[PDB]
Structure formats: structure tokens, C-alpha cells
Design a protein around this ligand. Sequence first.
Ligand SMILES: *[C@@H]1O[C@H](CO)[C@@H](O[C@@H]2O[C@H](CO)[C@@H](O[C@@H]3O[C@H](CO[C@H]4O[C@H](CO)[C@@H](O)[C@H](O)[C@@H]4O)[C@@H](O)[C@H](O[C@H]4O[C@H](CO)[C@@H](O)[C@H](O)[C@@H]4O)[C@@H]3O)[C@H](O)[C@H]2NC(C)=O)[C@H](O)[C@H]1NC(C)=O
Ligand SMILES: *[C@@H]1O[C@H](CO)[C@@H](O[C@@H]2O[C@H](CO)[C@@H](O[C@@H]3O[C@H](CO[C@H]4O[C@H](CO)[C@@H](O)[C@H](O)[C@@H]4O)[C@@H](O)[C@H](O[C@H]4O[C@H](CO)[C@@H](O)[C@H](O)[C@@H]4O)[C@@H]3O)[C@H](O)[C@H]2NC(C)=O)[C@H](O)[C@H]1NC(C)=O
Ligand SMILES: *[C@@H]1O[C@H](CO)[C@@H](O[C@@H]2O[C@H](CO)[C@@H](O)[C@H](O)[C@H]2NC(C)=O)[C@H](O)[C@H]1NC(C)=O
Ligand SMILES: *[C@@H]1O[C@H](CO)[C@@H](O[C@@H]2O[C@H](CO)[C@@H](O)[C@H](O)[C@H]2NC(C)=O)[C@H](O)[C@H]1NC(C)=O
Ligand code: NAG
Ligand code: NAG
Ligand code: NAG
Ligand code: NAG
Lengths: 409, 409, 56
Amino acid sequence: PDPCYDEHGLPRRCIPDFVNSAFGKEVKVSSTCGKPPSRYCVVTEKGEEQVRSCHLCNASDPKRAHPPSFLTDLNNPHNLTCWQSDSYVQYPHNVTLTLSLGKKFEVTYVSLQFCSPRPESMAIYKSMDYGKTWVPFQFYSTQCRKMYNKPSRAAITKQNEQEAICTDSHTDVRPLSGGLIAFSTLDGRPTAHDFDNSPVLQDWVTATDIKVTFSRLHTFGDRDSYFYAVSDLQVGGRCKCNGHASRCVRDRDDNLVCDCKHNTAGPECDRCKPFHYDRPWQRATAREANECVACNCNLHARRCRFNMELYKLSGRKSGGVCLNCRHNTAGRHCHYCKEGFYRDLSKPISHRKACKECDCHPVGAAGQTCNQTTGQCPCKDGVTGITCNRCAKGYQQSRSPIAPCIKIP
Amino acid sequence: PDPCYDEHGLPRRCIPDFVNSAFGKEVKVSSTCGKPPSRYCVVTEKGEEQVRSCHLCNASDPKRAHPPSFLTDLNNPHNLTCWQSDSYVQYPHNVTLTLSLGKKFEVTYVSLQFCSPRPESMAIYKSMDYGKTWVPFQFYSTQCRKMYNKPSRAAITKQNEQEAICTDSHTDVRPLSGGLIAFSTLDGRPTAHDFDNSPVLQDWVTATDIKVTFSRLHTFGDRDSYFYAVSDLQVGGRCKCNGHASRCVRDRDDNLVCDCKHNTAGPECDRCKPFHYDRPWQRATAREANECVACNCNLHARRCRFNMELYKLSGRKSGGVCLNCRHNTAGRHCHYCKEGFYRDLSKPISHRKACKECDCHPVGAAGQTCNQTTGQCPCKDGVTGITCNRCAKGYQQSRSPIAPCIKIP
Amino acid sequence: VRPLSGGLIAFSTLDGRPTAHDFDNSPVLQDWVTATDIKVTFSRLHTFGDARDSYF
Ligand SMILES: *[C@@H]1O[C@H](CO)[C@@H](O[C@@H]2O[C@H](CO)[C@@H](O[C@@H]3O[C@H](CO[C@H]4O[C@H](CO)[C@@H](O)[C@H](O)[C@@H]4O)[C@@H](O)[C@H](O[C@H]4O[C@H](CO)[C@@H](O)[C@H](O)[C@@H]4O)[C@@H]3O)[C@H](O)[C@H]2NC(C)=O)[C@H](O)[C@H]1NC(C)=O
Ligand SMILES: *[C@@H]1O[C@H](CO)[C@@H](O[C@@H]2O[C@H](CO)[C@@H](O[C@@H]3O[C@H](CO[C@H]4O[C@H](CO)[C@@H](O)[C@H](O)[C@@H]4O)[C@@H](O)[C@H](O[C@H]4O[C@H](CO)[C@@H](O)[C@H](O)[C@@H]4O)[C@@H]3O)[C@H](O)[C@H]2NC(C)=O)[C@H](O)[C@H]1NC(C)=O
Ligand SMILES: *[C@@H]1O[C@H](CO)[C@@H](O[C@@H]2O[C@H](CO)[C@@H](O)[C@H](O)[C@H]2NC(C)=O)[C@H](O)[C@H]1NC(C)=O
Ligand SMILES: *[C@@H]1O[C@H](CO)[C@@H](O[C@@H]2O[C@H](CO)[C@@H](O)[C@H](O)[C@H]2NC(C)=O)[C@H](O)[C@H]1NC(C)=O
Ligand SMILES: *[C@@H]1O[C@H](CO)[C@@H](O)[C@H](O)[C@H]1NC(C)=O
Ligand SMILES: *[C@@H]1O[C@H](CO)[C@@H](O)[C@H](O)[C@H]1NC(C)=O
Ligand SMILES: *[C@@H]1O[C@H](CO)[C@@H](O)[C@H](O)[C@H]1NC(C)=O
Ligand SMILES: *[C@@H]1O[C@H](CO)[C@@H](O)[C@H](O)[C@H]1NC(C)=O
């Protein structure tokens, strides 16, 4: 059924499977060859010396077009899809590419492959918002200082495991094409071995929007028109459901969201389902599914609230409390009968009719309300019974409209 | 398409077609020739006088057998299908033949076709139940008194059109064979001209199982073996669906039932369909199909109940009422938010969340029970606002977790 | 209302301005007419009486 629940349906952490994320989507870029139709020359190294070929780029030529689909189409190791930029541009200028997401994720794999040489200076960005704010992730350059004001290959301090390092690693050529960049966000991080309890890393993995800008690329000649090019992209990940959804589905307004199980809500299972507020929302752990939990109303309310001191002083047990206790019920669990009514002790603890009116004897009973727990109306001297109507043993009814029951001498 | 809806899809009375009923069925009888093999003699009149032949019956002889299928089979008026009983029998004895249908029907024509002379005394029965109770319809005899204790050619009183008449009419022979039976219950009835509004006659036509017993018969000569024989049976009718099904179909357990349209239930469309408890069940009329109608919850229940006085006091309009009137809704139409909630005015009357809570400011509002009319939360002192959150003119917010807003002199 | 339908509102920015007769020399007004993007927001509408109707 649902991997969110164990053999005996015991709630267990469920995550959408590890998949590539950026496979097949559209990307808006800063520039690309072919507008106006552009040319491009291609060098190949033969043994020890050089040989320079050359071609052209019109996007209106589909086979000579290089759309962002070339970035998102499947990379056939036998039919590559090389996109190319316009030429005659370098540092200092923003070489920016765009991405429109819509579900928050945590990522493990980011794979790349080059049709151009690997430049030297580059950096990473991210946005935990929806395209408004932007923050970096790491740097890559030989001149980490003069270009990026960065130390090269810094250490990941425990006190800031969210370090943004810079290095010249894999900023070199060869490779002139098909370059491979191996980056694991988990590298160097001291608290990576237990990520489920690494919230800074659970925040270091938090990302919604992504931005990438270039400045510097290698020069070699030393006429030519220099460019940027790439055949495809791979980035693997899992849809962020906090362990509370086994997958992610579209919304009623066409929005891919987690099918948040374990009584969780929000596109990421970030919040609990409504009326699940006895203990706060938490992320499913291997030891505990840290689920949401409702308030108890004994089948007599649909709204409830909570106080931290309640759960706090509960010895960490419970803090829910219901609102608008109907069925003449009242309490944190709507668990007692109000003024005017009493508790039908015979009836179940959560029954819809557990409360009965204090039908107190307008003569034999005095108050209008009876024992809201038992139902005992004000029984007079020899009168007994819940609502106090009858005479007791040795008590005779009299036509007196005030004292009907009289003892025996 | 469906005769239950007109050219403009208007729901109209749709009816099973008029067909012969006893065509091809089987009957259990009182007795029959051939066990042991029986004999019978046949006389014929020549011009003015008689001439007598004679025959025999073996049931084990297929062509000398006379099965009851001969009454129900396609009877060729030139290759007749005569069933025969054992002989040496006459009144007084129950000469009864059986028939169980299993579904209620409406019948108009009853015809017979004889291979024997027409007797004098006979009677009718029927069963408005499944073969348990039995009531007659009319009688036929010369001595309606000596045999049936009845008058011959009785009158159809208007106050009891359920009269059972007896007459000697057409009890004559000839026909000695090939008897012609044409009986219309509607003849003589002054109120037969509009059957759609004759319920006693619509009860007079009500029949489930039928019983017929025979009696007195002619002796002419006057050695003899007397018997009875008949070539076929034809009875026309339409399947009783109260005008709420255009036909009748078999069930998953081989049971011919109406495909009850018009929101009706029962094998005969006798009652409303489940949840069709807004007004009671009725029969399709020529002016109006007097259809059933479900209860309303505005998409908030699957079960409901009904009370007539609601429809009665509605000026004859409606009486349906929810069962488990869900989705924070309430009423006979699940048509209002119960105690604690109010109307999500933005949503339609049937929205799953058409009802809105009171998310009142736990500090600035005095309770979470805002008036179900306006979303106005319980603002305490000179504080105003919908959830009672902000301060008002002359009210400065304070960090006191009791009284934020305070007047100014 | 009326109009309940087909209501005709013809805002003329030119109405009422005393120096509109010489707008060709009204640069602040020549800025008041400058516009690139437009936004229109509502909150309130009339009432009557007093989901029967689905007001929209
Ligand atoms: C971007 O890169 C692509 C692919 O490399 C190039 O695509 C070219 O697209 C044009 C479309 O205009 C193609 O031109 C083709 O050749 C014709 C040559 O002229 C004759 O035209 C007609 C016959 O078509 C004759 O009657 C006439 O006498 C000429 O002899 C063009 O004229 C045609 O284009 C015609 O089509 C459009 C509608 O599509 C009409 O409105 C016009 O009448 C127009 O003339 C014909 O389609 C050409 O085949 C493509 N080249 C390729 C595929 O290599 C683009 O050229 C390039 N961008 C630029 C700016 O060059
Ligand atoms: C009711 O009506 C039916 C239909 O008309 C009559 O049916 C008869 O059924 C019997 C059944 O046996 C038929 O008998 C048949 O004739 C044989 C005659 O015996 C001779 O057989 C050959 C010549 O045919 C000789 O060489 C031999 O030496 C005998 O002298 C019977 O012996 C047969 O009966 C055998 O058949 C049945 C299966 O059918 C077996 O189970 C037995 O072994 C049995 O011995 C043979 O079947 C006869 O033909 C039918 N008569 C008809 C059709 O007219 C009934 O007679 C009738 N009943 C009464 C009381 O009237
Ligand atoms: C290059 O740098 C950044 C993007 O990498 C852009 O930032 C601009 O900063 C100025 C500073 O006042 C703002 O006024 C602009 O609105 C920013 N541009 C935005 C937000 O798009 C800068 O524009 C880039 N220059 C380019 C792309 O030519
Ligand atoms: C003739 O009339 C009816 C059937 O047409 C029979 O009525 C029987 O009445 C007795 C009364 O105690 C019942 O116990 C039997 O069960 C009835 N029999 C039925 C209903 O079949 C009556 O017996 C018939 N005469 C006969 C069979 O000789
Ligand atoms: C790769 O696919 C494109 C798609 O049109 C095709 O034109 C091209 O021939 C393919 N490559 C090879 C080597 O066949
Ligand atoms: C209700 O009945 C019990 C029975 O002994 C009694 O002790 C109590 O005082 C009554 N009133 C309450 C619980 O308010
Ligand atoms: C009448 O029908 C029976 C049924 O089988 C058949 O045997 C008989 O030959 C038919 N009669 C004629 C005259 O065809
Ligand atoms: C709720 O709002 C209505 C709307 O004006 C008002 O008349 C009423 O007094 C308020 N309080 C209630 C219904 O308790």
C-alpha cells in the first residue's frame, strides 16, 4: 500500500524516490548563438598539435539550432545535444541562466557534461524563495581572491557547516569538452553522517530557486569568437515530503505537491493537516515517524487549540484542547456535560447523547441544574431518584403541591 | 434513446410494451392423461346428427402426450397444441392449474382456445402476493346461485367496482371445441374511461400469482369418459413499473425486474431509490411522471431520511433531510454550518469547505465563537477588527498579554 | 445602479484641470500622462435586500 506505513501499517518515513529533477524542462537564458545567425569555429587536438574547424549557428536551422531543450533532452551518449551561447563576451559580465521550479527539494546528485572547455572562475547560487532572494552555495576559480575574494579549498568548520568554498579544481582544461564536475554538498560537512538530525544541513539542503552566473573562461590562442557550450545536464533528487509523503502529485490547480501522508499538509508536508495540533509537526525519523497528532474531543468537536506549557507541563505528553464543544458537552476533550444538563453515565464516554438535560422536578427538585456528572436533582428529605420525584421507603405521596412525600411516625 | 425522456430529454413515462404473457411457460396441473396411459372418445356432428370416434393418451407417447407446453407454445390454428387431463372426472372436484410469476405485472387481455366443449360453472382466483393469499375476480355459470350462491348478471355498483359477477352468457355449446374467450374487466365499469386515475381498478388489475378451479360441465346424450382440453393460452400485459421503467430486465440472480427509472426502487418501481427521501414515491401519470427526488445535502452526505409533514407543511414541496449531514454543514439540505462555524461565503452553497470557522485572535478576540452571520470575532474593549487584532482610533497596542489597546486622553 | 448592465464610465483625465488648455506646455501633466504598466484593484461593491445568489 503505502511505504509511509510499516508491515502492520506502522507509520514509517516515506520519501519520493531519487530521480533526476531538471529532465526535459524549459530554460530561459541570457543569450545564445544564432540571433543574428552566428558562426563558431571548432578546434581539435591531433596527437600534439592543433587543427581548427569552423561552423555556424542559426536557431532557425533546427539541426543548427541549440535550444535549452538541448540542456534538458535526454543525453544520448551517441546523440549529444550541444547548446551554445553568443560570442565575444567574458568577465566582467553576468552570464546568467534561469529556472522556474515550484516544489522545494533536497538534492544529492548534480552531473554535468561539456561541449565547451571548462572555464576557470565560477560560483553557485540558490534561492529558498520563489525567485525573489538569491544566495550562493560554493565558488570555483584559480583566483579565488582576486576574482571571488575567496580562500581556495577552505575547510568545513563544524560551527558553520554551510561553508561556501572556492577552488580551482575542475576549472582546468583538458577537459576541453565533456568536462565532469564532481560536487557533493555533503563533502567536508562534519554532521553529514546523520542528516536526519543535521538541521543546518537540513537547511543547507533547503532550496527552491537556483541561479548560475559566469564571468571568466580560459583563453588559449594566443580573431577567434569564444563561446559557452553544453550537451545535457543531470541533477538527481527526491521530492521534499519530510518523510511524510511517499511521492508527489499535482494539485487541483496543476501544482506538483507531496501527497502528504502522516496527517501532514503543505506542498512539502511542512505543516500538519487541520485539527492535528496536540504535539507540533516533526520530521519522520528511523526511530520515530514524528507525525502530527490531533486533539481529543470524544466525538464532540471539530476545532481545537494548543499551548506549549500544556504539552510542556504534560511531561511531554499532550496539549490539545477542543473548541466549540457541541452536544451540550464542554472541556478540553468536550468531556463533561454543561449547566442545565448532566452526563448519561450509562452511555459511552464519547457518545453524541452522553449529556441529558437536568429535568429537575419543579417541585421535588429545587435548582434548575442537576449533577452535571450524575444527574442528581435537589432531592428533598424523603425524595430519592436522579431527578428526585418519588417517595422513599416509608414515605407516602400527599396531594400537597410542595411536600407530597411524608415519612411515617 | 430512452422513452423515459422526450425529444428535449424531458422525463416522460416509459412503459414495457404490451406482450402475451403465458407464451412459452410451464404449469403444474391437477391431473393429466397418460399416467397410466388413458383413453378418450370423440363425437362429431354430421349435418344434423352425430358420429362418434375414440382415441387414447400415453404421456410416454410424445405425439399422444399432451404437455402443458401445448398451452404456452406457439399454437398453429392448423396444427393445434391440445393438452388433456385424465378422464372419468367431473364436478365436484377442484380442477385447478397453477402459475407463479415472481414479478408484479399489469394485464389487459385473457383469451382461451379450446380442444373441448365449454362447461357451465367455473371461477377465478388471483394472488396479489407470491402464491400465499388468493382472491377471485368474476364468475361464470348458469346457476350462479345453486353453484356460486350468486346472482346471474349482477350489476357493477359504482361504490364497489370490485364486484365479482356471474352469468350464463357464452357458456353455451357450440362451441364444442375452439372456444372463444374475450373478457375485458373494463367493460361495464363506468369509471373505465381513464385508467390512470382508477386505483381500485389499478388494484383490481393488481395481481402476482393466479389460481383457477373448474366445476360443472355438460352431459348431452345421455359409457362416457369426460375430460377437458385446450389448444393454447394467450394473455397480454405490460410489466408493472409504475411508469418508472420502460421495460423489465433480469437480475444478477435471474429475476425479471424493472430497470426502475424516475428515481424509483423495488422490482416494480414501487418505492423511491435510496437517499430519494425528499418526497415519497409516486407513479408516473400522463401529465406528470410523479418522480422521486433525492434528499439534499449540497454534497455533504450519502444517506438521508424523510418526513411527510415537512412536505405537507411545505405547501406540498419538500421533506428530505440529511443522514450524517457532513462537511461542517447541517440541515435537511446539509445547508448551514453547525455551531462553532460560519459560512465560507466565497464558496457555493455545496462546497466541501463552504463553511468557515472562527479563527479569532486568541489575544485580541475574546473567543473563537464569532457570530455565524458575520466573520466578526469577539472584539473585547474599544478594540475592533475582523479577527480583533489591530488597535483602533485612540487605542495603542501594549505588550501586555491581556490588554494591548488603551485609550488616549 | 442603474446601470445594472452596460454601465458607461468614461474617465477623461483632461476634465477639470485649469491648465489643460495648454497641455503642450504642461510638463508635470506631461508626466501625469506618462504610463507604462497599469493595475486595477477592487474590494467593495453595493448591497441590496435584505447561497441564494452567487454574486460575482
Ligand atoms: C537560418 O537557418 C535556416 C536553416 O539553415 C535558414 O532557413 C532557410 O529558410 C528559408 C525560408 O525563407 C528557406 O528559403 C527557401 O528558399 C527560397 C529561395 O527563393 C526562391 O523562393 C521561391 C521558392 O521557394 C521561388 O519562387 C523564388 O523565385 C526563389 O527562387 C525562399 O524564397 C523560400 O522562402 C520563402 O518562404 C516564405 C514562407 O516560408 C515565403 O514567405 C517567401 O516567399 C520566401 O521567399 C524557401 O523556403 C531556406 O530553404 C532555408 N535554408 C536552409 C534550410 O538551409 C535561414 O535562411 C537562416 N537565416 C537567415 C537569416 O538566413
Ligand atoms: C407409451 O407411448 C410410447 C410412445 O408411442 C410407447 O413407447 C414404446 O416404448 C418401447 C420401449 O421399449 C418401445 O419398445 C421397442 O420395441 C422393442 C420390441 O421388442 C423387439 O425388438 C426387436 C424388434 O424391434 C426384436 O428383434 C426383439 O426380439 C423384440 O421382439 C422393445 O424390445 C424395445 O424396448 C427396449 O428398449 C428400451 C430403450 O428404448 C431398453 O431400455 C430396453 O432394453 C427395452 O427392452 C424397443 O425400445 C416401443 O417402440 C415404443 N412404442 C411406440 C414408439 O409406439 C409405449 O408403448 C406406450 N405405452 C403404453 C402403455 O401404451
Ligand atoms: C549584473 O548583476 C546583477 C545580476 O547578476 C544585476 O543586479 C542589478 O543591480 C542593480 C543595482 O541597483 C539593480 O538596480 C538592478 O535592478 C539589478 N538587476 C536585476 C535585479 O535584474 C545587474 O543588473 C546585472 N547586469 C546585467 C544583467 O546587465
Ligand atoms: C378443494 O379446495 C381447496 C383447494 O382448492 C382445498 O382446501 C384445503 O382446506 C383444508 C382445510 O383444513 C386445508 O387443510 C388444505 O391444506 C387445503 N388444501 C389446499 C389449499 O390445497 C380442498 O382440500 C380441496 N379438496 C380436495 C383437495 O379434495
Ligand atoms: C540525432 O538526432 C537528430 C534528430 O533529428 C538527427 O537529425 C541526427 O541524425 C541524429 N544523429 C545521428 C548520428 O544520427
Ligand atoms: C454528584 O453525585 C456524587 C455522588 O456521590 C456526589 O458525591 C457529588 O457531590 C455530586 N455533585 C457533583 C459531582 O457536582
Ligand atoms: C404438427 O406439429 C408436430 C410437432 O412435431 C409434427 O410432428 C406434425 O407433423 C405437425 N403436423 C403437420 C400436419 O405437419
Ligand atoms: C453578527 O453579525 C450580524 C450582522 O449584522 C449582527 O446583526 C449580529 O448582531 C452579530 N452577532 C450575532 C448574530 O450574535
